């Protein structure tokens, strides 16, 4: 899945900014309701995180629910290059 580096940052930025994300299982959807990135690229990128245990996945009624994990926060900070004192919105 070749996600543009600009779109990849937006997903990681949003995911790190808020420790949760969701998506409708609709690959045709043009834009994610919370991110400019296309809906498909959100679903596939967080599939990569699910395989590396950076997120925890739930599915129900045609919707994905992803939750950041401790390792995911560790990874995203290095990728986004942010101060170690910043944490997702769910940890405050």
């Amino acid at each position: 899945m070749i996600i543009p580096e600009k779109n990849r940052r937006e997903i990681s930025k949003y995911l790190f900014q808020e420790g949760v994300c969701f998506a409708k299982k609709d690959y045709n959807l043009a834009k994610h309701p919370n991110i400019d990135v296309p809906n498909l690229q959100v679903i596939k990128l967080m599939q990569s995180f699910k395989s590396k245990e950076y997120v925890r996945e739930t599915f129900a009624w045609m919707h994905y629910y992803w939750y950041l994990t401790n390792d995911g926060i560790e990874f995203l900070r290095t990728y986004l290059n942010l101060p170690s004192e910043i944490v997702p919105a769910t940890l405050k």
Partner: protein, 213 residues
Amino acid sequence: QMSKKRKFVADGVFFAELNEVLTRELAEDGYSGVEVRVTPMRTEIIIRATRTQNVLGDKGRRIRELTSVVQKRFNFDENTVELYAEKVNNRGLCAIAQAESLRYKLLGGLAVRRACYGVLRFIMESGAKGCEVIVSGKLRAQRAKSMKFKDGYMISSGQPVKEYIDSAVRHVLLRQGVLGIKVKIMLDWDPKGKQGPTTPLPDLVTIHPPKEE
């Protein structure tokens, strides 16, 4: 603005979908139900679970994740919806909790006969009028069969079933296929309305003892 017919249906669909999302997210935390208390300026969601310490997480981390994802998914205004965990007062009278309790025993490896009697014995000790556990599927042989564990009082027909019977159905995904768990608990008449229904059984007639004064 939408008509009353669609608004009530939309409220029912939100409750049904929220329960399913929590039924899977909190499967191994004793999730037993939810109550949606919509009020002005705030909608309160009360999560019932036998083990609340695992639903809240460390310092309430998990309950905040559930609140955040629920608010975004269901188009709620930020800081306008709250989730509160709560404990089931009598875990042995909740069929949904016993069905999930039986589920994890079977997954762990406990024998079906022993696991089903542990639930059946626990429910009757908790003050139930009766209980019935049914397990169906490929137990040991290739061909499927049903085992029924029954104890005490039980009813099947009529209106009272809706008030006096607490039933749940769950699927156990074992290595040879799927087992079906059915827990059916008959409650006892509780005038206070907490342990069981306050209305008595239709055919139960009580004669007051006469007084000698």
